[PDB]
Design an enzyme around this catalytic site. Structure first.
Site, PDB file in Angstrom:
ATOM      1  CG  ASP A 161      -1.973   1.125   1.143  1.00  0.00           C
ATOM      2  OD1 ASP A 161      -2.366   1.529   0.017  1.00  0.00           O
ATOM      3  OD2 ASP A 161      -2.393   1.600   2.222  1.00  0.00           O
ATOM      4  NE  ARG A 165      -3.656   5.458   1.648  1.00  0.00           N
ATOM      5  CZ  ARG A 165      -3.650   5.066   0.376  1.00  0.00           C
ATOM      6  NH1 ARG A 165      -3.559   5.961  -0.597  1.00  0.00           N
ATOM      7  NH2 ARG A 165      -3.756   3.779   0.074  1.00  0.00           N
ATOM      8  CG  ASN A 166       0.615   4.208   4.034  1.00  0.00           C
ATOM      9  OD1 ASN A 166       0.190   4.371   5.182  1.00  0.00           O
ATOM     10  ND2 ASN A 166       0.021   3.404   3.156  1.00  0.00           N
ATOM     11  CG  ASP A 179       0.883  -0.256   6.229  1.00  0.00           C
ATOM     12  OD1 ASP A 179       0.871  -1.483   5.971  1.00  0.00           O
ATOM     13  OD2 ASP A 179      -0.086   0.492   5.971  1.00  0.00           O
TER      14      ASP A 179
HETATM   15  C1  LIG Z   1       2.787  14.234  13.723  1.00  0.00           C
HETATM   16  O1  LIG Z   1       2.052  13.262  12.979  1.00  0.00           O
HETATM   17  C2  LIG Z   1       2.456  11.918  13.111  1.00  0.00           C
HETATM   18  C3  LIG Z   1       3.847  11.560  13.173  1.00  0.00           C
HETATM   19  C4  LIG Z   1       4.256  10.208  13.304  1.00  0.00           C
HETATM   20  N1  LIG Z   1       5.594   9.844  13.367  1.00  0.00           N
HETATM   21  C5  LIG Z   1       5.985   8.546  13.495  1.00  0.00           C
HETATM   22  C6  LIG Z   1       5.053   7.489  13.571  1.00  0.00           C
HETATM   23  C7  LIG Z   1       3.648   7.795  13.511  1.00  0.00           C
HETATM   24  O2  LIG Z   1       2.627   6.813  13.587  1.00  0.00           O
HETATM   25  C8  LIG Z   1       2.895   5.518  13.134  1.00  0.00           C
HETATM   26  C9  LIG Z   1       2.810   5.228  11.754  1.00  0.00           C
HETATM   27  C10 LIG Z   1       3.072   3.926  11.291  1.00  0.00           C
HETATM   28  C11 LIG Z   1       3.430   2.866  12.195  1.00  0.00           C
HETATM   29  C12 LIG Z   1       3.505   3.186  13.605  1.00  0.00           C
HETATM   30  C13 LIG Z   1       3.240   4.491  14.050  1.00  0.00           C
HETATM   31  O3  LIG Z   1       3.837   2.228  14.600  1.00  0.00           O
HETATM   32  C14 LIG Z   1       4.475   1.037  14.100  1.00  0.00           C
HETATM   33  C15 LIG Z   1       3.734   0.500  12.872  1.00  0.00           C
HETATM   34  N2  LIG Z   1       3.710   1.529  11.801  1.00  0.00           N
HETATM   35  C16 LIG Z   1       4.321   1.212  10.568  1.00  0.00           C
HETATM   36  O4  LIG Z   1       4.623   2.074   9.740  1.00  0.00           O
HETATM   37  N3  LIG Z   1       4.578  -0.120  10.328  1.00  0.00           N
HETATM   38  C17 LIG Z   1       5.123  -0.673   9.172  1.00  0.00           C
HETATM   39  C18 LIG Z   1       6.239  -0.054   8.521  1.00  0.00           C
HETATM   40  C19 LIG Z   1       6.793  -0.618   7.343  1.00  0.00           C
HETATM   41  C20 LIG Z   1       6.231  -1.804   6.815  1.00  0.00           C
HETATM   42 CL1  LIG Z   1       6.899  -2.490   5.378  1.00  0.00          CL
HETATM   43  C21 LIG Z   1       5.133  -2.439   7.438  1.00  0.00           C
HETATM   44  C22 LIG Z   1       4.579  -1.870   8.620  1.00  0.00           C
HETATM   45  C23 LIG Z   1       3.253   9.165  13.374  1.00  0.00           C
HETATM   46  C24 LIG Z   1       1.865   9.511  13.313  1.00  0.00           C
HETATM   47  C25 LIG Z   1       1.454  10.875  13.180  1.00  0.00           C
HETATM   48  O5  LIG Z   1       0.049  11.081  13.134  1.00  0.00           O
HETATM   49  C26 LIG Z   1      -0.750  10.399  12.169  1.00  0.00           C
END
Ligand SMILES: COc1cc2nccc(Oc3ccc4c(c3)OCCN4C(=O)Nc3ccc(Cl)cc3)c2cc1OC
Length: 294
Positions: A161, A165-166, A179
């Site tokens: 995906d 947005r990701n 993600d």
């Molecule tokens: C200030 O605004 C934001 C800043 C952020 N900065 C860092 C992380 C944020 O949230 C996430 C976003 C994604 C994931 C996560 C937390 O926790 C772990 C899982 N995750 C992943 O991305 N997992 C992942 C990664 C790579 C692959 Cl291949 C598969 C899964 C954030 C969300 C925000 O507000 C929305």
């Protein structure tokens, strides 16, 4: 598959819950902003993002979050993939996944906020374009995501995906692939033809998605296939060769690369390795146009 049951090096990832100060929610599992006390050897205090299970979540949801942690651990570290800092898995509190915090959020929303703050190249006095985005920025972001995807591919992992947005934007213009795990999102606009019609996901279908990501980047967060209804005729014409037109801020080469990523034949699409090399060249070449300070 059943990654939640892979071995866990507690001595390497476990973090004391008490050394965490949960703050306001960022979105909803559910991600929360927080402060971590000495989670890395780069600062005694640091902002982080924490993903945790909701209140009384099913065992299935528990496995899902634990599986995500194991996958992140398995993938490993890369500058362009949201960094895993630690986890709170032992008894005493909820399961928590801790990652670095990315100040600016998702790339799509960010770019749209810069529509009136963009110029291909700054002209002296540059203070007139303070914090403006430039072709160098956009190419740099494209280049960083390509390197992140090249890395995931080498770990035999398929994103499935890939969209703006990701993509998260941290400080100093460093982007991280992530993600949120998500309908109103119209995910079909990022899906390759073979994925739509045959439900097959491969690193080559990810390259197709990377093409839509480039379009998003060079349109400054516009919505893919502007105003087009995503119905059956869309899928039909897509398999027949219909492609998006060049977005407003693209360069001739970036648009051609988009077209390359959207090749009907999965095998005829470039590989992320080829994209890293190619985008790296476009970046170097773009700089060659901005010679005021040489
Ligand atoms: C200030 O605004 C934001 C800043 C952020 N900065 C860092 C992380 C944020 O949230 C996430 C976003 C994604 C994931 C996560 C937390 O926790 C772990 C899982 N995750 C992943 O991305 N997992 C992942 C990664 C790579 C692959 Cl291949 C598969 C899964 C954030 C969300 C925000 O507000 C929305």
């Amino acid at each position: 598959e059943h990654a939640e049951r892979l071995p866990y090096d507690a001595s390497k990832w476990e973090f004391p819950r008490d050394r965490l100060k949960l703050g306001k929610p960022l979105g909803r599992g559910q991600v929360i902003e927080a402060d971590a006390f000495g989670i890395d050897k780069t600062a005694t205090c640091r902002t982080v993002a924490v993903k945790m299970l909701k209140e009384g979540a099913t065992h299935s949801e528990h496995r899902a979050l634990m599986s995500e942690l194991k996958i992140l651990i398995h993938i490993g570290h890369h500058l362009n993939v949201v960094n895993l800092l630690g986890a709170c898995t032992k008894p005493g509190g909820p399961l928590m996944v801790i990652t670095e915090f990315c100040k600016f959020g998702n790339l799509s929303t960010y770019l749209r906020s810069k529509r009136n703050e963009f110029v291909p190249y700054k002209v002296a006095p540059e203070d007139l374009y303070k914090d403006f985005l430039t072709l160098e920025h956009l190419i740099c972001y494209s280049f960083q995501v390509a390197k992140g995807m090249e890395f995931l591919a080498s770990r035999k992992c398929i994103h499935r995906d890939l969209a703006a947005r990701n993509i998260l934007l941290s400080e100093k213009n460093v982007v991280k692939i992530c993600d949120f795990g998500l309908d109103a999102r119209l995910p079909l606009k990022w899906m390759a033809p073979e994925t739509i019609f045959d439900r097959v996901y491969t690193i080559q279908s990810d390259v197709w998605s990377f093409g839509v990501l480039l379009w998003e980047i060079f349109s400054l967060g516009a919505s893919p296939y502007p105003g087009v209804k995503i119905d059956e005729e869309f899928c039909r014409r897509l398999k027949e060769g219909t492609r998006m037109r060049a977005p407003d801020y693209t360069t001739p080469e970036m648009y051609q690369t988009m077209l390359d990523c959207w090749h009907g034949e999965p095998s005829q699409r470039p590989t992320f390795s080829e994209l890293v090399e190619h985008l790296g060249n476009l970046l170097q070449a773009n700089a060659q146009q901005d010679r005021h300070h040489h």
